Design a protein around this nucleic acid. Structure first.
Lengths: 185, 83, 221, 141
RNA sequence: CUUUAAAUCCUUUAACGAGGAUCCAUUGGAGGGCAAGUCUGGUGCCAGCAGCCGCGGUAAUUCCAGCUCCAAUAGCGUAUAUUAAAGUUGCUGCAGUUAAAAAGCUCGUAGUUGGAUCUUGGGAGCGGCCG
């Protein structure tokens, strides 16, 4: 009898076919285009997309104008819109089945940071994110898997406590300046 | 087939047997499209128009194509009713 | 260098008095010249060999071995075909299989799953096909499901154009020839299945011969 | 299914249970004699003591004499055999040593050209055999 | 500093702290199943590899070593118990002439399953035959 959590849940499923050519090709292409550390992240994205798809199918397989169906569909569609995948003109339940994994990855913090025009390369964006360099709406962000929302899109830039956004320099510039000053005297 | 608007997505409509009301597939070479010409009542002459029939391969293979053609021609008004 | 047709259908398709092969399928005209498909279906036709089984027969002169090739060709828009050819040399066997697969292609039709919105994406019904001791059935799937099957039938279906489908096989799937023929027979009956959508009476368009006899009587003697 | 009556469930269940019981894998997994005859007794591993080293021949046209160990168990005193997997690892095993024995992996079935051997050696003298092969560790002396 | 019964842990901030950034990432494989060498050197039905087929007989792509290579990558291999694959336990949904399998035949108590036929139309109306 201890006050604990006991709640755990996986987030990925390993493909049943171990050695496939097309599957590896698509996974490698996605990792290369969007800068992923390993196949676990594309697997977790596939798992959550499959969960969303099966939930949509379960909601769709019932009759029209069912209050539970309408409530759950409206909630899920609003969640998808505020995440930033669907548009304002596509608010129908059957449009859920026509989503792509690239649509989910393009809302990643890493790729959005790379795209908005403050990092040279996507790997550069990821390494900038991981080393705590920029913030999201007056809050410092650290993890590139941050699912960026819709309203929280125009208020992300460099941080105040960063050498790039205006602040005290880092660890190498001060050391080089000290070395130069010591050499000068 | 239909859609939101109402247009057709089937790239071709297949044929259909005039006797057994069964459609004709693409790789069904036994199907026959028969043309029967009518005769003007005034004197008896060829005019230029015709009547088209279609029989699936199964009917001919089983051997009831001639009876079906006879029935179709009788119904259309070619074969005499008393016969 | 220009293609010389043999039958009068070749004359019609070469002289450009025909517009498409859809009515060729509609009238169920057999195809004997493999270049008609090339004329109609251009660079969008892709072929891929499946497997090579060296068949070996024994005689008084010792064992005799030759190769039989399986290949599937078809554009990714609704036309799919299979070809089988056996020859002494493997390369000539591949060419013959390609020619035979090009000669025999059956168009397929696709439907929707409940919500009839957009372009067709799945098999309209629960088609079936059996040859030898292999039975393959195709079940419609919602959008984005994919092609869940063995690699060879998945390749064949995605070559045909049916992106969403469910499959179920029974028997000796190890024999690639019988399994491929069964999954081709199952996909070749998607049109030959009377659906209440097609209950309308069909108007009999005149046969191409009956309309172009005035040209075929003077082209070839 | 043959009997399809709306009130025929007991007969169907009895026939199904009989046909399931008279099977092979279900019968093996649901009878006490199979586990009683198992040298381990349903355990994944079991320690033993070496009695003498023995060599065995081949079965298919694969002539190569292979060396095993005649090991006597500890829990029940059963005397079994054990194959030494890797190359030239028989020298690492001396007489009367603590050896951990595990099955080969085919569920108590002879494998390959080695007749009558269903086990293998994984640990000797509380030291892993893989470490003794790669030289990462060393057998105490 | 802060937290805390007092402390450790997390966060915050000073002062240091990286170029082969030696502040150096392993586990099983490279014949097919199953993604990856007719590479090089060594023993030659021996030593061994091998879940299966099989690889070794003086040119071994399969054994022993080096380079290269593929898979997951703070993780990977092995034994066991078990689930889907098993439409090889089949209620959905398996088979019984020749591959495993219809009692030698009939009667028969339980159990199971049982033919047809008993109810119908109009009145008024919301409305463009029928909502």
């Amino acid at each position: 009898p201890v006050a604990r959590s006991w709640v755990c849940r996986k987030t990925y499923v390993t493909p049943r076919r171990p050695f496939e050519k097309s599957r590896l090709d698509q996974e490698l292409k996605l990792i290369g285009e969007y800068g992923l550390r390993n196949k676990r992240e594309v697997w977790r994205v596939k798992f959550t997309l499959a969960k969303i798809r099966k939930a949509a199918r379960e909601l769709l397989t019932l009759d029209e104008k069912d209050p539970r169906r309408l409530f759950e569909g409206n909630a899920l569609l609003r969640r998808l819109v505020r995440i930033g995948v669907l548009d304002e003109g596509k608010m129908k339940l059957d449009y859920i089945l026509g989503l792509k994994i690239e649509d989910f990855l393009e809302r990643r913090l890493q790729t959005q940071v790379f795209k908005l025009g403050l990092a040279k390369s996507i790997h550069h964006a990821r390494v900038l994110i991981r080393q705590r360099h920029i913030r999201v709406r007056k809050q410092v962000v650290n993890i590139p898997s941050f699912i960026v929302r819709l309203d929280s899109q125009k208020h992300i830039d460099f941080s105040l406590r960063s050498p790039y956004g205006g602040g005290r320099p880092g660890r190498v510039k001060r050391k080089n300046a000290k070395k130069g000053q010591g050499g000068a005297g | 087939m239909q859609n939101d608007a109402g247009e057709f997505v089937d790239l071709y409509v297949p044929r259909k047997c005039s006797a057994s009301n069964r459609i004709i597939g693409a790789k069904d070479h036994a199907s026959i499209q028969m043309n029967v010409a009518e005769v003007d009542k005034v004197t008896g002459r060829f005019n230029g128009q015709f009547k088209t029939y279609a029989i699936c391969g199964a009917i001919r293979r089983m051997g009831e194509s001639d009876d079906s053609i006879l029935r179709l021609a009788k119904a259309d008004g070619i074969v005499s009713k008393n016969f | 260098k220009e293609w010389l047709p043999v039958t009068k259908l070749g004359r019609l398709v070469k002289d450009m008095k025909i517009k498409s092969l859809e009515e060729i399928y509609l009238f169920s005209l057999p195809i004997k010249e493999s270049e008609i498909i090339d004329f109609f279906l251009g660079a969008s036709l892709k072929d891929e060999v499946l497997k090579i089984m060296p068949v070996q027969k024994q005689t008084r002169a010792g064992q005799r071995t030759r190769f039989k090739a399986f290949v599937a060709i078809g554009d990714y828009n609704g036309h799919v075909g299979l070809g089988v050819k056996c020859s002494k040399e493997v390369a000539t066997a591949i060419r013959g299989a390609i020619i035979l697969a090009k000669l025999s292609i059956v168009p397929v039709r696709r439907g929707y799953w409940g919500n009839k919105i957009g372009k067709p994406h799945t098999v309209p019904c629960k088609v079936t096909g059996r040859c030898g001791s292999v039975l393959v059935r195709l079940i419609p799937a919602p959008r984005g499901t994919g092609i869940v099957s063995a690699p060879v039938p998945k390749k064949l279906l995605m070559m045909a154009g049916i992106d969403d489908c469910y499959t179920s096989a029974r028997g000796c799937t190890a024999t690639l020839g019988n399994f491929a023929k069964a999954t081709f027979d199952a996909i070749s009956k998607t049109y030959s299945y009377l659906t209440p959508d097609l209950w309308k009476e069909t108007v009999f368009t005149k046969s191409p011969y009956q309309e172009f006899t005035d040209h075929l009587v003077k082209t070839h003697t | 299914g043959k009997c399809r009556g709306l009130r025929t469930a007991r007969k169907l269940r009895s026939h199904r249970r009989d046909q399931k019981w008279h099977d092979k894998q279900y019968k093996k997994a649901h009878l006490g004699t199979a586990l009683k005859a198992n040298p381990f007794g349903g355990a994944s591993h079991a320690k033993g003591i070496v009695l003498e080293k023995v060599g065995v021949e081949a079965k298919q046209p694969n002539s190569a004499i292979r060396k095993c160990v005649r090991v006597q168990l500890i829990k029940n005193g059963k005397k079994i055999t054990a194959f030494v997997p890797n190359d030239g690892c028989l020298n690492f095993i001396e007489e009367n040593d603590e050896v951990l024995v595990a099955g080969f992996g085919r569920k108590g079935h002879a494998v390959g050209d080695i007749p009558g051997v269903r086990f293998k050696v994984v640990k000797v003298a509380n030291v892993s055999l893989l470490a003794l092969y790669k030289g990462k560790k060393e057998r105490p002396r």
